[PDB]
Design a protein around this ligand. Structure first.
Ligand SMILES: CC(C)C[C@H](N[C@@H](CCc1ccccc1)C(=O)O)C(=O)N[C@@H](Cc1c[nH]c2ccccc12)C(=O)O
Ligand SMILES: [Ca+2]
Ligand SMILES: [Ca+2]
Ligand SMILES: [Ca+2]
Ligand SMILES: [Ca+2]
Ligand SMILES: [Zn+2]
Length: 316
């Protein structure tokens, strides 16, 4: 759309009030012109046909309960752009300020969200397993980081390379959650998952085993489901990345933490310089040690904490 950039106010999935960047041209659109080539949010109207319609509002006020998932997807996609730009110097997911598209209200009671190769897509949840999935900032950034991986390492979505694909989306989803300072933790999907039960979440980085996922390489899943367990085996990498950041003794191996800024920037470098579409866990260990070397020196503590974390998880 061509029009005048302006600012609206809305309420998100969790009832919080926020200002969002809109574009005025007879209606007010969910089009944000201030970031790259724009951030566009679309109404999928409970269908499965994408993208849907670009979101149009009469008065630039987004307080209807139908509005909520659109306010959050549009807002959080903004924060995520800002994290990659400000922290890593990356302009959009392609590095060239590509436009960022999301659709909300996809299907009926659809308990998932995904990146389809061109766009992000958010279910509303059935009301009991989930509530509308864009209400989670770690969920939004997990999704946007899949676009980042696609343009860079290209990690094939199956077996080990797939699980590394998933861990990368969890890791940067959490770093965006700490970036925004929005009640941040080392869990995934907590703000949106099971509104009935308090204190849980989809996956844990700090203790994957809490939900039954492997936290050590010998406990790797080897069958066939979940594309060879891409959402399962990512537990092993998630635990490594948690240890590098925070520190700890895990299966009797001790790791000093080097914190979350260095974590992200060892991972971002591994991702953009060293990883390839078929990389396995033990190539991720080489890439991460090589990154930390580049950045901090061969006999840094940073290099040493990377080696310990991967030993602690049985990866090499
Ligand atoms: C970040 C998370 C909130 C949503 C996230 N969405 C997935 C994309 C999943 C997808 C793939 C193909 C076709 C449709 C959907 C991803 O980005 O890897 C996920 O981890 N999905 C898992 C876990 C999950 C989502 N919905 C579920 C329903 C029940 C139990 C677990 C789940 C899954 O697809 O397995
Ligand atoms: Ca309105
Ligand atoms: Ca949180
Ligand atoms: Ca979280
Ligand atoms: Ca819950
Ligand atoms: Zn994913």
């Amino acid at each position: 759309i061509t029009g005048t950039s302006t600012v609206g106010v809305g309420r998100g999935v969790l009832g919080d009030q926020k200002n969002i960047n809109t574009t005025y041209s007879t209606y007010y659109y969910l089009q944000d012109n201030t970031r790259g080539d724009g951030i566009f949010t679309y109404d999928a109207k409970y269908r499965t046909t994408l993208p849907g319609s670009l979101w149009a509002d009469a008065d630039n006020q987004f307080f209807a309960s139908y509005d909520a998932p659109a306010v959050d997807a549009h807002y959080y996609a903004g924060v995520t752009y800002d994290y990659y730009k400000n922290v890593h110097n990356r302009l959009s997911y392609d590095g060239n300020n590509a436009a960022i598209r999301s659709s909300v209200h996809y299907s009926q009671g659809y308990n998932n969200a995904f990146w389809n190769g061109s766009e992000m897509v958010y279910g509303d949840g059935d009301g009991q397993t989930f509530i509308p999935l864009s209400g989670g900032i770690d969920v939004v950034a997990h999704e946007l980081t899949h676009a980042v991986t696609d343009y860079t390492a290209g990690l094939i979505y199956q077996n080990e390379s797939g699980a590394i694909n998933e861990a990368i989306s969890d890791i940067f989803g959490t770093l965006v959650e700490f970036y925004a300072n929005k009640n941040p933790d080392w869990e995934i999907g907590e703000d949106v998952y099971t509104p009935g039960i308090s204190g849980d979440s989809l996956r844990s980085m700090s203790d994957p085993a809490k939900y039954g996922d492997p936290d050590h390489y010998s406990k790797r899943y080897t069958g066939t489901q979940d594309n060879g367990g891409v959402h399962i085996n990512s537990g092993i990498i998630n635990k490594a990345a948690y240890l590098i950041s925070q520190g700890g003794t895990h299966y009797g191996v001790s790791v000093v933490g080097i914190g979350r800024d260095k974590l992200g920037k060892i991972f971002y470098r591994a991702l953009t310089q060293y990883l390839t579409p078929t990389s396995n866990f033990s190539q991720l260990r080489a890439a991460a040690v090589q990154s930390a070397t580049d950045l901090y020196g061969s006999t840094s503590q940073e290099v040493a904490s990377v080696k310990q974390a991967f030993d602690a998880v049985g990866v090499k």
